[PDB]
Amino acid sequence: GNPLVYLDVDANGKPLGRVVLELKADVVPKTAENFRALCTGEKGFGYKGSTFHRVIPSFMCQAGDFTNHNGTGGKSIYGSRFPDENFTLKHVGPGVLSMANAGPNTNGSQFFICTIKTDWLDGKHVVFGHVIEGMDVVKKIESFGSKSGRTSKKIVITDCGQLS
Numbered sequence: 001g002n003p004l005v006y007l008d009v010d011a012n013g014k015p016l017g018r019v020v021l022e023l024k025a026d027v028v029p030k031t032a033e034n035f036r037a038l039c040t041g042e043k044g045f046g047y048k049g050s051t052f053h054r055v056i057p058s059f060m061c062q063a064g065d066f067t068n069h070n071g072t073g074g075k076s077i078y079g080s081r082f083p084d085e086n087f088t089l090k091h092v093g094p095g096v097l098s099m100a101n102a103g104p105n106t107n108g109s110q111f112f113i114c115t116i117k118t119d120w121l122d123g124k125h126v127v128f129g130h131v132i133e134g135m136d137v138v139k140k141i142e143s144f145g146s147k148s149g150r151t152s153k154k155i156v157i158t159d160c161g162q163l164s
């Protein structure tokens, strides 16, 4: 069925624990496949070692720029960017996993995990999964953000991969 993947996350070099994500390949197979492969690193690049570079309390935690390591970069397994697959899934609440972007059809590798319902992003960001386990870890990450998005600890995905 739908892939289960994980992110193991450090803050200032010490482990917070594991976030487990279900990828909704049934609804958004291309977007789910991209994220899955970036977790395993099987194409020779991916999320391992990359950061949560911008985190805003009571909103979301954003990550996945493994090319420029500053929020301007990332790439997909298909090429630098790929289209918005569909907007069928909605930003319904905490734990939603969705693609960051720079406008229409600019999905790469950057993603975010919501910590609240973010309805204004519906129709603009492709939702492609949800947290299965580890919301406690997500709340810790969230607690290290700020209004400007700047993090107060260095938040690193030390390991990631596929569970099923």
Ligand SMILES: Nc1ccc(CNC(=O)NCC(=O)N2CCCC2)cc1
Binding pocket: 060, 062, 071, 072, 073, 074, 099, 100, 101, 102, 106, 107, 108, 109, 110, 112, 125
């Ligand atoms: N592929 C790609 C994706 C994102 C960017 C830079 N864009 C962003 O940080 N956009 C903000 C964004 O998507 N957000 C922030 C609310 C969580 C969703 C640049 C390239």
